[PDB]
Design a protein around this ligand. Structure first.
Ligand SMILES: CC(=O)N[C@@H]1[C@@H](O)[C@H](O)[C@@H](CO)O[C@H]1O
Ligand SMILES: *[C@@H]1O[C@H](CO)[C@@H](O)[C@H](O)[C@H]1NC(C)=O
Ligand SMILES: *[C@@H]1O[C@H](CO)[C@@H](O)[C@H](O)[C@H]1NC(C)=O
Ligand SMILES: *[C@@H]1O[C@H](CO)[C@@H](O)[C@H](O)[C@H]1NC(C)=O
Ligand SMILES: *[C@@H]1O[C@H](CO)[C@@H](O)[C@H](O)[C@H]1NC(C)=O
Ligand SMILES: *[C@@H]1O[C@H](CO)[C@@H](O)[C@H](O)[C@H]1NC(C)=O
Ligand SMILES: *[C@@H]1O[C@H](CO)[C@@H](O)[C@H](O)[C@H]1NC(C)=O
Ligand SMILES: *[C@@H]1O[C@H](CO)[C@@H](O)[C@H](O)[C@H]1NC(C)=O
Ligand SMILES: *[C@@H]1O[C@H](CO)[C@@H](O)[C@H](O)[C@H]1NC(C)=O
Lengths: 610, 5
């Protein structure tokens, strides 16, 4: 038997919410509230209600005003439900409420102009429908507040002054709203703040030098705003800074000396800014740096020779910059290097690059695309990359043959050599990589037949090959042609298992044994010299989604068995020698005429047509 | 072709 006041308040609360939780089915009868689901009391369990924690209960409805009658409640947690409409005023007057988590519901409207919650520690409204002015006036009566989480709301208007009066504020999360203007100078009074997310708003102006006043910062997320100007060179004042996220802004200048000297930074992401000049870090000074993303900037000059002196730097993305010259010779010592993305950086001497980089024994994923333009792909067979998983060197217009030194990387998972000038036959050892699920050799000069060993590729047949996906900190992008919008893959295993051989000079038949690859999603043979019959055994490729045979010289008929490919949504035989009926119904009726054009193929009952 | 940025 509990207090009549709590009993009442709790009965009204649940009157507005469905479903009734497990222990609340007795609610209108039962007098023992403290043993209801998600309720806690003082004394032992036997006093006033101090905690109402109903998070992730699938609760649907509105909040009762009589929630404000629980005088002793220190913790109110309704997060991860379907609760909607307004927050009752009476909730903002609870004298004992330490912890308020309303995050992730459908709540809307606005916060009252007058709030008195003297005991409040953490305040979490994130992931809701709240708009309007930021409730910075909460600082007046909650002098103890540690945590304000407002992220993922509709707050627009100025980033409003007044948070600086929450003197003990530690976490402040404003991310993913519509805020405009610069950071109120008010904010720079919070000397105990260790987390500032402002990311994904419309904020702009320079990032003030007054930021040196927030000396407790650990994580600074400024990403995805309109900031510009130089990054202020204050970072010796922020000795605890571990994560700095500035990506997708208008920052200019280089990396400030103080940031380039910070011993505490784990992670620096400045990608997609307006940054420029020589790239200078003092790697003797940055002993915590494990991850560096400078992509889509204008850094120029040579690649900094001292980079391997960051003994912890695992992840490096320098892509889409203005460098020139070769990979420094010191990169032989980059012992920590795992993921190295150099795409589109104007690098020279792929020969030196590969001969140096083979000495980095932790290298797993390497992206060299759009460098070394017109160079000759090194065939030199002392090259050995032992732990290599992902190798992308594409659209470099490279010359030579398929390099056999590659055959010794047994871990290899994804290989993209496409859009080069490579020539000669595709060698048998390409079928020997057991972990390879993706290979793009397309748009080269390759000749000869298709090696039969592609039919016994292990990751494309059985399910008994199992390996760990590489985990670089950057996404990968995929372009079909020069004017196509790109596709994004955050993880390597997001790529469909793929054999892409199109636009080469390959000849001979399509092996019946391709019916062995049960796990292949994409088979692209288009724009080759291939001939013979389309094998009926292809109906055995059970995971097949896209089959492109177009622009070859293939003869005979489309085998009916192909209609047993359950997942095939994308098919073309156009520009071949084929004849007869296109198989009716099922899967093939969904393909457009263009899939069969420039053949002698006709729809059923239409033969001959032309 | 695959690229990175
Ligand atoms: C711009 C600037 O220096 N503002 C400072 C801050 C400081 O933290 C606050 C109280 O400590 O008083 C003032
Ligand atoms: C609220 O409850 C959820 C889900 O039960 C929990 O994960 C979360 O940490 C709680 N909120 C607070 C501030 O503890
Ligand atoms: C602080 O509390 C007083 C008395 O409860 C109230 O009148 C006032 O509006 C509150 N201030 C703010 C800014 O919420
Ligand atoms: C680069 O910045 C532009 C403009 O800020 C933005 O629209 C674009 O999405 C950014 N690119 C990436 C990949 O972040
Ligand atoms: C780089 O940092 C180290 C360690 O703090 C320091 O001793 C050294 O003088 C710095 N070098 C430069 C170029 O500032
Ligand atoms: C290389 O990778 C291994 C295996 O994960 C790791 O334990 C080791 O610390 C790495 N070496 C360096 C110098 O980073
Ligand atoms: C490569 O770099 C140039 C800028 O130097 C840019 O115009 C082009 O869009 C980039 N292409 C890709 C695919 O990154
Ligand atoms: C490129 O690299 C190779 C191997 O280090 C070197 O022998 C050669 O002289 C270099 N070529 C140029 C143009 O510097
Ligand atoms: C193949 O690559 C070249 C550049 O190496 C490009 O210009 C051409 O358009 C590509 N062809 C196709 C159809 O992808």
């Amino acid at each position: 038997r509990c207090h009549p006041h709590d009993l009442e308040a709790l009965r009204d609360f649940i009157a507005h919410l469905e479903p009734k939780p497990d222990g609340w089915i007795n609610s209108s009868s039962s007098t023992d509230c403290c043993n209801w689901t998600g309720i806690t009391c003082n004394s032992n369990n036997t006093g006033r209600v101090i905690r109402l924690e109903l998070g992730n209960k699938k609760l649907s409805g509105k909040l009762s005003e009589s929630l404000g009658k629980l005088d002793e409640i220190r913790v109110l947690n309704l997060s991860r439900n379907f609760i909607k409409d307004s927050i009752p005023l009476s909730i903002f007057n609870l004298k004992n409420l330490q912890t308020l988590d309303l995050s992730s519901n459908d709540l809307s409207g606005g916060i009252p102009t007058s709030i008195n919650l003297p005991a409040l520690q953490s305040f979490d409204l994130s992931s809701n429908k709240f708009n309007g002015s930021l409730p910075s006036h909460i600082c007046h009566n909650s002098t103890q507040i540690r945590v304000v989480k407002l992220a993922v709301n509709y707050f627009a208007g100025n980033f409003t002054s007044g948070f600086g009066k929450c003197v003990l504020l530690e976490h402040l999360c404003l991310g993913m709203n519509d805020l405009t203007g610069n950071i109120p100078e008010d904010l720079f009074h919070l000397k105990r703040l260790n987390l500032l997310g402002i990311q994904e708003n419309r904020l702009s102006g320079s990032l003030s030098r007054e930021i040196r006043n927030l000396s407790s910062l650990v994580r600074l997320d400024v990403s995805w705003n309109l900031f510009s100007g130089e990054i202020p060179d204050v970072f010796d004042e922020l000795p605890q800074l571990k994560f700095f996220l500035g990506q997708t802004n208008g920052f200019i200048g280089g990396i400030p000396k103080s940031l380039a000297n910070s011993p505490s930074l784990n992670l620096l992401n400045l990608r997609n800014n307006s940054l420029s000049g020589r790239l200078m870090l003092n790697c003797t000074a940055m002993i915590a740096l494990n991850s560096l993303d400078l992509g889509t900037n204008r850094f120029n000059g040579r690649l900094p020779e001292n980079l391997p002196d960051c003994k912890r730097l695992k992840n490096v993305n320098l892509a889409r910059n203005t460098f020139h010259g070769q990979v420094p010779e010191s990169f032989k010592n980059f012992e920590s290097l795992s993921y190295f993305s150099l795409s589109n950086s104007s690098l020279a001497n792929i020969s030196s690059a590969l001969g140096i980089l083979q000495h980095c024994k932790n290298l797993t994923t390497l992206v060299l695309t759009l460098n070394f333009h017109g160079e000759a792909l090194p065939d030199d067979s002392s090259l050995h990359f032992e732990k290599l998983k992902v190798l992308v060197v594409a659209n470099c217009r490279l010359t030579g043959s398929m390099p056999r030194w590659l055959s010794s990387s047994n871990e290899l998972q994804l290989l993209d050599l496409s859009w080069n000038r490579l020539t000669g036959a595709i060698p048998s050892w390409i079928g020997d990589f057991k972990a390879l699920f993706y290979l793009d050799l397309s748009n080269n000069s390759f000749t000869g037949e298709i090696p039969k060993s592609l039919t016994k590729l292990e990751s494309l047949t059985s399910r008994n090959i199992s390996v760990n996906e590489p985990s670089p900190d950057f996404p990968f992008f995929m372009k079909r042609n020069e004017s196509a919008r790109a596709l994004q893959y955050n993880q390597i295993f997001g790529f469909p298992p793929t054999i892409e051989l199109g636009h080469n000079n390959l000849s001979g038949p399509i092996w019946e044994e391709f019916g062995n690859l049960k796990k292949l999603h994409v088979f692209d043979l288009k724009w080759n010299a291939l001939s013979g019959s389309i094998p009926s055994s292809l109906s055995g490729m059970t995971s097949l989604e896209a089959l492109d045979l177009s622009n070859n010289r293939l003869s005979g008929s489309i085998p009916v068995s192909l209609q047993q490919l359950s997942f095939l949504s994308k098919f073309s035989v156009a520009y071949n020698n084929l004849s007869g009926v296109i198989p009716s119904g099922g899967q093939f009726q969904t393909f457009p005429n263009s899939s069969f054009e420039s053949n002698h193929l006709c729809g059923e009952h239409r033969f001959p047509c032309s | 072709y695959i690229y990175t940025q």
